Amino acid sequence: EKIAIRDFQVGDLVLIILDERHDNYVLFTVSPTLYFLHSESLPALDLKPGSRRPWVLGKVMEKEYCQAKKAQNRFKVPLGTKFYRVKAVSWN
């Protein structure tokens, strides 16, 4: 198995990393688009909400495309930003 870096599909192995700027876990990607880890997947990956672990390997599951409708939001992106929210489970 190899780590996907863009165009994420169900079942892809991915590297989930702590993004300091957004203080949220995101998928490691070469895409300009943000792929945020769904908050419900934190326990699935043994991660804590916000010392935090810098990365973990996971497997892509459900994915949703989103747009920020408010200027200040939980993803810490500007108003109008389009991004993904991805669920993931532990590898193996």
Residue numbers in the entry: 1494 to 1543, 1550 to 1591
Tell me, in the authors' exact words, what the paper reports.
The formation of autophagosomes requires the hierarchical action of a number of conserved factors, including the upstream-acting ULK1 complex containing the scaffold protein FIP200 and the downstream-acting conjugation machinery, which catalyzes the conjugation of the ubiquitin-like ATG8 proteins to the head group of phosphatidylethanolamine on the isolation membrane. Crystal structure determination shows that the FIP200 CTR contains a dimeric globular domain that we designated the “Claw” for its shape. The interaction of p62 with FIP200 is mediated by a positively charged pocket in the Claw, enhanced by p62 phosphorylation, mutually exclusive with the binding of p62 to LC3B, and it promotes degradation of ubiquitinated cargo by autophagy. The Claw is constituted of a six stranded, mostly antiparallel β sheet and a short α-helix.
We also determined the crystal structure of the isolated Claw domain without the adjacent coiled-coil and obtained higher resolution diffraction from this material. Crystals of the isolated Claw diffracted to 1.56 Å, permitting a precise characterization of side-chain conformations and ions and waters of solvation. The isolated Claw crystallized with a monomer in the asymmetric unit; however, the unit cell contains a crystallographic 2-fold-related molecule that interacts through interface-1. Three sulfate ions from the crystallization medium were bound to the isolated Claw monomer at a location distal to the dimer interface-1 but overlapping with the putative FIR binding pocket. These sites are of interest as sulfates ions of crystallization often serve as markers of biologically relevant phosphate binding sites. Sulfate 1 is coordinated by the main chain amide and the side-chain hydroxyl of S1532 and the guanidino groups of R1573 and R1584. Sulfate 2 is also coordinated by the side chains of R1573 and R1584. Sulfate 3 is coordinated by both the main-chain NH and side chain of R1573 and is near the side chain of K1569. As compared to the structure of the CTR, which does not contain bound sulfate ions, R1573 moves by about 4 Å to engage the ions, while other residues in the pocket only move minimally. The proximity of these three sulfates was suggestive of a potential binding site for a tris-phosphorylated peptide segment, such as perhaps the tri-phosphorylated S365-S370 segment of p62.
